[PDB]
Amino acid sequence: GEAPNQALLRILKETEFKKIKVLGSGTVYKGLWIPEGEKVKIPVAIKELREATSPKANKEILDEAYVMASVDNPHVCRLLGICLTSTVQLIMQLMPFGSLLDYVREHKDNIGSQYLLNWCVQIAKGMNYLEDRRLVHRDLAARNVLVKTPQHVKITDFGRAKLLGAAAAEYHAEGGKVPIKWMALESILHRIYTHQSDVWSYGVTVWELMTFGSKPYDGIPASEISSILEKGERLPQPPICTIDVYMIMVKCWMIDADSRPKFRELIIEFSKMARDPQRYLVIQGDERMHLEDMDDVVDADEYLIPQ
Ligand SMILES: */C=C\C(=O)Nc1ccc2cccnc2c1
Numbered sequence: 001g002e003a004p005n006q007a008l009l010r011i012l013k014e015t016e017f018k019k020i021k022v023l024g025s026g027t028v029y030k031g032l033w034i035p036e037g038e039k040v041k042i043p044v045a046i047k048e049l050r051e052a053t054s055p056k057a058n059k060e061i062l063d064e065a066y067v068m069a070s071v072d073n074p075h076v077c078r079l080l081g082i083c084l085t086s087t088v089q090l091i092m093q094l095m096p097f098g099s100l101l102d103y104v105r106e107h108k109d110n111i112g113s114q115y116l117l118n119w120c121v122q123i124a125k126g127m128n129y130l131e132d133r134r135l136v137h138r139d140l141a142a143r144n145v146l147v148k149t150p151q152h153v154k155i156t157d158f159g160r161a162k163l164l165g166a167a168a169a170e171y172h173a174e175g176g177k178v179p180i181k182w183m184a185l186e187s188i189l190h191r192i193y194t195h196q197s198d199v200w201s202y203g204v205t206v207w208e209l210m211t212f213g214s215k216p217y218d219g220i221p222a223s224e225i226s227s228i229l230e231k232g233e234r235l236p237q238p239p240i241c242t243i244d245v246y247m248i249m250v251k252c253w254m255i256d257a258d259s260r261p262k263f264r265e266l267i268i269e270f271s272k273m274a275r276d277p278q279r280y281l282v283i284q285g286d287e288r289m290h291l292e293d294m295d296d297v298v299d300a301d302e303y304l305i306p307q
Pocket residue numbers: 023028045076077078079092093094095096097098146154156157
């Protein structure tokens with residue numbers, strides 16, 4: 001019916017890694033992973049559940065683990081393994097600069113057009129790969145992209161991710177706390193999710209980046225979004241955006257899903273713009289901007305296990 005998912009899920013001993021410090025409150029730690037019987041140290045982020053008495057929460061972390069184990073792309077976050085102690089631990093690649101949402105808010109005065117457009121390309125490559133894998137993210141947002149380096153971002157948070165119905169080329173959900181301000185009209189109205197609903201949220205994510213992390217429809221209640229969208233209203237042109245960039249964002253927000261660009265087309269359009277960034281974004285001072293033993297440290301991206 002479909003191709004078998006031969007991804008490996010790696011179980012790690014808790015003695016294989018050291019928590020160095022806390023990054024956020026379950027709880028995320030900065031840490032180091034020594035693959036058992038390998039002379040390598042891998043910077044990791046270790047996500048540990050708090051209560052561990054919640055069967056619900058345990059199902060949710062393993063779903064995430066299932067999806068992150070099944071993706072292998074330079075622009076999607078990858079899981080190194082899980083640890084089944086009292087509290088289940090997810091070990092992933094450390095992404096030391098944090099979320100791109102925070103990163104553009106914190107660095108709004110240092111970020112030039114070449115970085116914004118290259119990020120739009122990389123997120124499009126990430127999302128096109130996911131589409132190839134028949135995977136619908138359903139929660140794409142500048143908060144859900146992480147910064148390995150200012151040159152290199154990755155889509156994260158597969159908590160909401162689901163497969164597309166090949167026989168049913170759409171997903172059908174039922175309740176929760178949801179990101180109304182990022183969602184396609186068909187999603188808010190009919191809980192319909194596709195790759196094309198992922199393109200709508202890709203549009204909003206590009207608007208967050210191009211406004212240096214402004215809040216979409218700030219001050220408008222979630223209850224009002226569906227009406228506003230139905231009245232043909234959309235997020236306004238960011239000051240730095242040429243009409244070229246903004247028109248692409250607007251195409252991602254068309255009511256007809258099949259009228260939106262494909263991720264493969266967004267790769268192409270942002271790359272053309274990436275070859276001449278000052279033609280496509282106008283930024284003040286753009287021209288003048290730049291962004292134990294570590295002996296056996298290697299990045300996760302240079303740590304490959306056989307396929
Ligand atoms: C690409 C693996 C991954 O998802 N890494 C991840 C997750 C959370 C987080 C928080 C703070 C710093 N780095 C990371 C990295």
